[PDB]
Amino acid sequence: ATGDERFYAEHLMPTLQGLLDPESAHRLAVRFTSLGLLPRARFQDSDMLEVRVLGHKFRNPVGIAAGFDKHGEAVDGLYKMGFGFVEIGSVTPKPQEGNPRPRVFRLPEDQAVINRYGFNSHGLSVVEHRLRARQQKQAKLTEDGLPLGVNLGKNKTSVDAAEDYAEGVRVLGPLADYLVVNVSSPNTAGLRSLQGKAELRRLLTKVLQERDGLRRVHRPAVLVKIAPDLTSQDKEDIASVVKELGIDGLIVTNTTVSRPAGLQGALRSETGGLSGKPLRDLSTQTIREMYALTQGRVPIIGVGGVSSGQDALEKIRAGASLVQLYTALTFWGPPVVGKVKRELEALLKEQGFGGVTDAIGADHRR
Numbered sequence: 193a194t195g196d197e198r199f200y201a202e203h204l205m206p207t208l209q210g211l212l213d214p215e216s217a218h219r220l221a222v223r224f225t226s227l228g229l230l231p232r233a234r235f236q237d238s239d240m241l242e243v244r245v246l247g248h249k250f251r252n253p254v255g256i257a258a259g260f261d262k263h264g265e266a267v268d269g270l271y272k273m274g275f276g277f278v279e280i281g282s283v284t285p286k287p288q289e290g291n292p293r294p295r296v297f298r299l300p301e302d303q304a305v306i307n308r309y310g311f312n313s314h315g316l317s318v319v320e321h322r323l324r325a326r327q328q329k330q331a332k333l334t335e336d337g338l339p340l341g342v343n344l345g346k347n348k349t350s351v352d353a354a355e356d357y358a359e360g361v362r363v364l365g366p367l368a369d370y371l372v373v374n375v376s377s378p379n380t381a382g383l384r385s386l387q388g389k390a391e392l393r394r395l396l397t398k399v400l401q402e403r404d405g406l407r408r409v410h411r412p413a414v415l416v417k418i419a420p421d422l423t424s425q426d427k428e429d430i431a432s433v434v435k436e437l438g439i440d441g442l443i444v445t446n447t448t449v450s451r452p453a454g455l456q457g458a459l460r461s462e463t464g465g466l467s468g469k470p471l472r473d474l475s476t477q478t479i480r481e482m483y484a485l486t487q488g489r490v491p492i493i494g495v496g497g498v499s500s501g502q503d504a505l506e507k508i509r510a511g512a513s514l515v516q517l518y519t520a521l522t523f524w525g526p527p528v529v530g531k532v533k534r535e536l537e538a539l540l541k542e543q544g545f546g547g548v549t550d551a552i553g554a555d556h557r558r
């Protein structure tokens with residue numbers, strides 16, 4: 193390990209967290225990142241970490257999960273941090289405030305967070321203009337193995353969920369390498385019901401028609417982000433719809449409304465989605481299930497509790513082609529990105545994989 197990793201993890205981050213409420217801390221993190229005020233990213237990505245998936249090259253398989261940069265303000269700073277790809281959002285069609293404060297909570301004893309933001313969003317028009325200001329810069333980044341994802345949500349008061357997602361495809365689709373249909377936020381009433389077979393089929397048919405209507409150079413992959421709290425029936429149904437419609441991939445998983453036995457944080461019974469270590473293995477097992485149900489033919493972005501190279505490799509071996517993290521960044525700071533990549537490379541070598549690609553779904557072939 194490096195000195196930076198230790199300093200951030202043991203001293204700087206815990207000290208700053210002791211001084212700032214979680215939302216203020218988040219806002220400062222976005223601001224600092226957007227301005228490029230970050231420790232020097234020492235880790236050079238090796239060829240072993242390159243993944244080709246979703247019609248793109250990814251320089252490394254470690255991305256920033258949705259919810260950190262909700263409004264597309266810090267994309268370049270996130271690449272500077274060493275992320276192989278950036279996902280922004282969720283973005284709603286109209287601007288909306290989200291829930292009253294406080295709405296984010298740290299569980300330090302669990303290395304977890306609970307949030308109930310409720311899709312606070314600058315809205316499609318603001319984010320569209322923000323991305324347009326760097327659209328050609330992004331085109332070059334994408335070509336150089338650094339793709340951009342855009343995660344779409346729906347407004348609280350909308351009377352037509354499918355039309356909300358359709359508007360997101362039309363407005364932000366042309367600026368994204370991939371789009372995410374987020375039907376798994378636990379913080380918007382009725383949203384998770386869109387994961388049901390009939391609702392999902394209707395919704396995704398509309399989303400895919402809108403995507404297919406975009407010009408070729410502006411036509412993103414479409415992925416669906418799912419909950420960790422689905423029944424076996426729900427998962428079978430999602431896999432069936434994914435295959436029927438030719439959905440490009442899955443993001444597995446969002447936060448959990450479960451509260452695993454053993455949580456110690458004083459704030460464990462706050463309403464919202466739980467992220468970080470207590471989610472890790474629930475997410476891994478959901479990746480494992482979804483990979484098997486889709487016969488390994490549908491790319492999966494694995495997310496939930498990734499804080500180390502071992503966490504990343506477990507999700508990759510379970511069937512993820514790429515991974516994302518968020519909560520680990522909140523505890524360990526920017527050095528966690530290089531840490532995960534360096535550990536992942538070392539483990540791939542130790543386990544006799546030629547690269548990340550060889551390890552994808554390896555557990556299913558044991």
Ligand SMILES: Cc1cc2nc3c(=O)[nH]c(=O)nc-3n(C[C@H](O)[C@H](O)[C@H](O)COP(=O)(O)O)c2cc1C
Binds near residue numbers: 260282305447469497
């Ligand atoms: C504060 C916070 C805000 C989030 N906002 C979003 C969001 O807007 N859209 C989304 O799809 N996921 C959102 N997520 C979920 C993350 O993208 C990710 O699925 C989840 O936190 C698991 O990863 P982690 O354990 O590495 O944080 C959010 C998570 C947190 C902690």
Ligand SMILES: C/C(=C/CC/C(C)=C/Cc1c(O)c(Cl)c(C)c(C=O)c1O)[C@H](C)O
Binds near residue numbers: 219298
């Ligand atoms: C350059 C940086 C300075 C960070 C200062 C700080 C105090 C971060 C903790 C933190 C939290 O405590 C919490 Cl609760 C959240 C949600 C977030 C959400 O992002 C979060 O970043 C970052 C590391 O990129």
Ligand SMILES: O=C(O)c1cc(=O)[nH]c(=O)[nH]1
Binds near residue numbers: 374376379
């Ligand atoms: O905005 C939020 O509350 C939010 C959205 C989401 O998809 N996941 C999450 O944990 N929080």
